[PDB]
A paper describes a structure:
In most bacteria, cell division relies on the synthesis of new cell wall material by the multiprotein divisome complex. Thus, at the core of the divisome are the transglycosylase FtsW, that synthesises peptidoglycan strands from its substrate Lipid II and the transpeptidase FtsI that crosslinks these strands to form a mesh, shaping and protecting the bacterial cell. The FtsQ-FtsB-FtsL trimeric complex interacts with the FtsWI complex and is involved in regulating its enzymatic activities, however, the structure of this pentameric complex is unknown. Since the divisome peptidoglycan synthase is essential for cell division in most bacteria, and is absent in eukaryotic cells entirely, it is a key target of important existing antibiotics and new antibiotic development.
Here, we present the cryo-EM structure of the catalytic divisome core complex FtsWIQBL from Pseudomonas aeruginosa at 3.7 Å resolution. The density for the membrane domain of PaFtsWIQBL reveals 13 transmembrane (TM) helices, including ten helices from FtsW, plus one each from FtsI, FtsB and FtsL. The periplasmic domains of the PaFtsWIQBL complex extend about 70 Å away from the membrane in a “Y”-shape, with the FtsI transpeptidase domain (FtsITP) and the FtsQ β-domain (FtsQβ) located on opposite arms of the Y, and FtsBL connecting them. Taken together, this shows that FtsQ is tethered to FtsWILB via its FtsQβ-FtsB interaction, while FtsQPOTRA and FtsQ™ are flexibly attached in the current complex. FtsL and FtsB have similar folds, each consisting of a long α-helical coiled coil segment, followed by a short α-helix and a β-strand. FtsL and FtsI form an extensive interface in the periplasm, with a total buried surface area of 1035 Å2. Importantly, no direct interaction was observed between the FtsB coiled coil and FtsI. Alignment of both complexes on the FtsW/RodA subunits places PaFtsITP and TtPBP2TP almost opposite to each other, requiring a ~130° rotation of PaFtsITP/TtPBP2TP for their interconversion. Using the cryo-EM structure, the active site of FtsITP does not reach the peptidoglycan layer, but does so in the more extended AF2 model. Thus, the cryo-EM structure and AF2 prediction may represent the inactive and active (catalytic) states of the divisome core complex, respectively.
Residue numbers in the entry:
A (entry chain A): 20 to 147, 152 to 219, 233 to 384
B (entry chain C): 142 to 273
C (entry chain B): 12 to 44, 51 to 560
D (entry chain D): 12 to 96
E (entry chain E): 7 to 93
Write the structure that this text describes.
Amino acid sequence: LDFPLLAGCLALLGLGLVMVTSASSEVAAAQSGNPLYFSVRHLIYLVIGLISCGLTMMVPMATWQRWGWKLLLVAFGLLVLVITPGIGREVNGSMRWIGFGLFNIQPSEIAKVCVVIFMAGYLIRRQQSWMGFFKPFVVLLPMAGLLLREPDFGATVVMMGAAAAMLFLGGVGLFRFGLMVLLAVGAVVLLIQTQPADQFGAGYQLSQALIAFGRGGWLGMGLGNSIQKQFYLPEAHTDFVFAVLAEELGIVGALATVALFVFVSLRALYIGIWAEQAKQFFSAYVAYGLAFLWIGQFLINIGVNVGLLPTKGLTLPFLSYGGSSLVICCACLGMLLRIEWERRTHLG
Amino acid sequence: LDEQLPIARWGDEALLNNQGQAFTPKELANYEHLPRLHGPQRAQQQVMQQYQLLSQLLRPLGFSIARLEMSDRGGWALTTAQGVEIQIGRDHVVDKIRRFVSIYDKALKDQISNIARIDLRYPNGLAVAWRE
Amino acid sequence: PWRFCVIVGLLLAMVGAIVWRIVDLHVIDHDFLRSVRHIAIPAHRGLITDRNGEPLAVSTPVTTLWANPKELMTAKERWPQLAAALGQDTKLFADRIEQNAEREFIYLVRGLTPEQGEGVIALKVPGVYSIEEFRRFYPAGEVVAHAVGFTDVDDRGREGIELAFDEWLAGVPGKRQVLKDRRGRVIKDVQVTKNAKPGKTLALSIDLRLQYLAHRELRNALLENGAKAGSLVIMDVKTGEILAMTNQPTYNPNNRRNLQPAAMRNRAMIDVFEPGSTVKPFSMSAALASGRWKPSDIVDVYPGTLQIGRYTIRDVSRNSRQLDLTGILIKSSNVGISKIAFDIGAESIYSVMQQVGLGQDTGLGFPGERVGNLPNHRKWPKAETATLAYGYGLSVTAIQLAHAYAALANDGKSVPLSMTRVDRVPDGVQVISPEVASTVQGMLQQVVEAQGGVFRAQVPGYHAAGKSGTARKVSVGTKGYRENAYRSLFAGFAPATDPRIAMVVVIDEPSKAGYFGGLVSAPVFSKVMAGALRLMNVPPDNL
Amino acid sequence: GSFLMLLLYIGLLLSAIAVAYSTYWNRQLLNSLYSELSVRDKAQAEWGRLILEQSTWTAHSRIESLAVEQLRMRVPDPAEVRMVA
Amino acid sequence: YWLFVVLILALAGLQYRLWVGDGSLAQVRDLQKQIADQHGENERLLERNRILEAEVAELKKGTETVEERARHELGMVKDGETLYQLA
């Protein structure tokens, strides 16, 4: 298989596991009873994600070429259900999760992978006309509209950025590409038009991570010694897990994580390059899309954590909490390991 | 099912066993000969065991304890079958008992008929009040 | 494809911007970078106990009111209201607050009973809170004031054992984390960084019964003799413990309002004096340790006005011609001691005097514990030898004099002093051979018992063994001494058959009845050993 | 080696989660220890208050006067003492 | 096989922090034993000062038990009593 990519992604996965275990203990103990609640559920999410990655490794690629239509059908079903009441719970200003028991499901990630797959299936057909210009927009504009009517802005931002970049790889115009990008930007700005310090309140996070980084130090203060995570931040294992990692592992660990994210993401883009050289256009394009989705999520998370960008309560791949995000990340992992497998079929 | 041991009386109301938990049986007046024990409200844990150990320790002396009392201060007062009261004192109960046993075996062999009280509340010895 | 290159370059540029920003914030602005506060929780002092079980110094809770002036600027109209609850002028209180407005922690009242604490806080002025500050309290009062000393308002030792054992009594404080605000108010108690260490209980060797006793009859002695001051020391001879020790005039440690420092003056450790005829037993010990002299050697002291160079060694009594060594001690013959010192030489005298501990220091460590001075010379001037023989021209405080007499009573096995209680039997240096020690104890017994000596110092039912003395107090400015200002001294041990208790009794300037040691300090000596020997539970040997 | 690498990595993960759990547990035990020391401090505060209130009445001179007056207790005479060894 | 060194170093550091550092299970047992002994002395001191408040309660209203202290501190005796001393 792919030893380096698998090693890097498993390093990310295990580091996320230890980070959530170290950062969620206080809140789990306080508002959940047993101190090991988020960590124990994260371990189960991790193992089912590994099983799902294996399953995606055991299912052929042409199925995504042919059986994708039902995938987007169920994606549309889940995206309808996330907005209807009764089968959805509203938490922190948004009813993003749908519950089937102990497995709360966020449909944004499955929607993202499905829309990437269909974009690739369209772009393998119409890389080279205005009809093609208008046709790709109906694929993602309903996605952005639904996910922005729901209070979810980071998902729409990563959708737009990933889509624009992964069109930019595989046929780009001179000014018409900028035209479609500007029309997408205008659409999202119109959607924004439709629907438009604080340390004593719940806005503690804006300067909490800032002062935390100020007190972080080069080497850090070791495992589980941060003083800005014990009831200071609810759900810190999801949004500011990178800030917790920074406090816990110093500049050394923080830069190691940033660089290893960069390594695995550029390896994804570069295996997409191989697939392009391997005459597997569908695989190449889906790899480019998945890699840019990952880098977009990573960049927006680090940017909101460092404070360069407004608040964006979005998860971090393989590090933050959430069953859906990790399961979809593991499925993407399986897809990439497949792309390696089909590329290696002629090599080995 | 454990059976309570009628070995001690708490005042004139309750009955005590080796552990000394407060239990009261069907008939109370039957135990005239059983020793009388007294203590504070929070004292059904220690008076009975102190009485048992003191009886075991003073058995070679030929002394059978009649009444045992504890003030809330903790100072112990002891009365025997011969009718002489003993003020053992607050603390150092075992040291004072050994001291009194030695003094009785040495210089109180047959003087057991002219003592009003025996006061052990001394760091060195004891005081004996005499009766005509 | 160059789109590859441009996308990878843009990604690397964003990552570089991120890492540049984070390295800028982490280290460069670390010093610049209301949220969290790291606070220290104080610890409480230890317990000072007597030999067996009686507490001597305890820490008691007292409600102390403090305020945060940052919260108190909102009380510009309320400072006049609050000043009434304090007892200070409203304008003066406002001035006091405004001069320390920048200050975060300020104390308003300390030493206030809790009930008045609720009474004052009933005004509910923001920023005012009550804390359970511990105040040191002394059950024994002025009785053991000098032997325990006291702490200050900062709960730090200042005198006596309190200053001597700050590292043992006052435990190290603990560290805590809190969620402070802009006004300094704490939202939530955050995890304790490091917990406080409880103070360890120090058990003194002083017995409070003997201390009460000695204090009682020593103030009785002062009122009976009308003297300025006095002191007394009790010592166990087998272990060197200070079983009791007192000084007068005393001070009440719990009420320190205008106590003049001479009331604080622990004369048993700060006041130096020449022992006078008190050091005759050490001279005899040297004489019988050399082996030249014998206890049954007749010494002629006539006419009692021996001349040495330009100096005259006057003797108190000139009516006795021939006097033995025991007679020398009984009569305190300066001529006899001078002659025996000339015969033996002052070298061995100074040897035994440094060996016993006179003029030296001991492992006690008290503030102002003086050292004394026993002069040492390579040669031996005749007048110097005489003065060393009969006591003058020297300075020794009462504590090490008691130590020396305890060593004499301890078969010459001098033991270092230990005011703290001793758990294991100490092993000291055999300063004096057993034969010389036994002989010296015998001569001391005949000194106290035989006629012509100190009849007032005899202890009923006990063989006393002591020696009197008188010190001509030193005058500052005029080289020498001050007229009609003598200190009465007495020291000894009991029972003479097998010593277990030592004593030194010093009374300063008795100007009403007399200045003789056997006239002033002897009855006190007898009374304190009667009581102390009764309490120490030793068998009497007389009937 | 690949299986050995997997076992070593999962052991490292177990060690890391154990370290996190143990650090949280130590924080909890420190909180409990502070609770018990506060209990001990207030108990000794009550004890010191009681001692302060008692000392004003159990004084040596007062108890001497009480013993000699009320119960007519007298200081023992060494002439009449049964010394026993 | 390069990455084995980093994993060995990380596992060694983690085990050191798990057996030596402030988060060690050794410190867990240390604090557990410390709290156990602390609670034991709490209960003993509560019994002690409860006895103290009981005796001060008797002191202010009674006199028959002040004889305990009057004859322990002073060794005093009443007129019709004889001291039997052991030494």
